[PDB]
Write a protein that binds this ligand. Sequence first.
Ligand code: TCH
Ligand code: LDA
Ligand code: LDA
Ligand code: HG
Ligand code: NA
Ligand code: NA
Length: 308
Amino acid sequence: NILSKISSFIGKTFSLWAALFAAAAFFAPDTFKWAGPYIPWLLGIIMFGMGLTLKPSDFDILFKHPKVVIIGVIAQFAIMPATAWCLSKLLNLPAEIAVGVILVGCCPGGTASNVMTYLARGNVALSVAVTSVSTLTSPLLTPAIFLMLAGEMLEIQAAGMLMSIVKMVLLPIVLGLIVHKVLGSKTEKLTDALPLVSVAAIVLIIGAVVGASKGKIMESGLLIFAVVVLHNGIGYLLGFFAAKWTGLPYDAQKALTIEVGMQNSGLAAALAAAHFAAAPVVAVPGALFSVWHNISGSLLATYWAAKA
Ligand SMILES: C[C@H](CCC(=O)NCCS(=O)(=O)O)[C@H]1CC[C@H]2[C@@H]3[C@H](O)C[C@@H]4C[C@H](O)CC[C@]4(C)[C@H]3C[C@H](O)[C@]12C
Ligand SMILES: CCCCCCCCCCCC[N+](C)(C)[O-]
Ligand SMILES: CCCCCCCCCCCC[N+](C)(C)[O-]
Ligand SMILES: [Hg+2]
Ligand code: NA
Ligand code: NA
């Protein structure tokens, strides 16, 4: 039973563990540099877990309230990519950093936003459906939006991103969804192992990325951190006003604020490792975002849980 309490604590203190592993990789790169070629498999395991936990009723809100889910999807792909582009222009970021920030911005939402919405006492059904739709549509929308913002010069890289998202995100989500229909209620035993396995997989992606870019973090790490904080923070701000100005209720407003600001930044780190391998700093905005958004997401959720 102690293993369940240990898993619960690790989950409730994720960011602190992710920050420790990022620091371990920063002081000792050779501890996690071996995980680099395993990054696609590590993210694939996380995506398999999402589909495994995904049931057909998680899409009910999409058929009962299509306009609410669609506003969420539009806000995710309009705000985050535009914010990444604006900050890259505003702060005159060097090309490799700007591409890394645009990549994070073009990614779909993160699973953790579902838990943050539950803690914020927001519309959980809406949070779950927006993440699922943004993720399922990402094979086409992530490379197409990346291509428009980062520039038509990265056509080869963006085309390869479509293939990578199919292999690391779509292939595992589907394989996970079929298992849930196959085993039925028996999948609960397999979902209990998921938090620990997923945490281990993501800290290994973070560790591998930080280790491969020590020198680049030594020169631009602080600038990347400031951009990450502003990117995620502005994502909450614009996400709130998009939910409010479309006339959505308070529960939906909290769901969409978190939805927009929180990103599948592990996918961004994976896509940068696979398509811009010769430039290790490109994966850095994604790696730092995976640590940061959980900290800011819990702060915002805590404020709303205290208010309600
Ligand atoms: C379940 C966690 C939230 C913990 C929580 O509920 N805290 C509230 C405490 S309380 O009510 O006051 O008692 C969240 C926070 C950080 C999340 C993890 C991080 O976002 C990192 C990866 C992200 C991957 O895409 C999914 C797995 C994952 C490894 C996430 C699994 C899970 O959603 C975590 C671990
Ligand atoms: C639990 C299994 C989950 C299935 C995840 C499969 C994703 C495969 C990714 C391998 C990609 C290898 N690579 C880097 C050469 O493209
Ligand atoms: C539009 C984004 C993708 C949404 C796909 C979600 C699949 C759920 C569709 C329900 C299919 C099950 N059925 C046939 C019983 O309705
Ligand atoms: Hg701008
Ligand atoms: Na969500
Ligand atoms: Na998002």
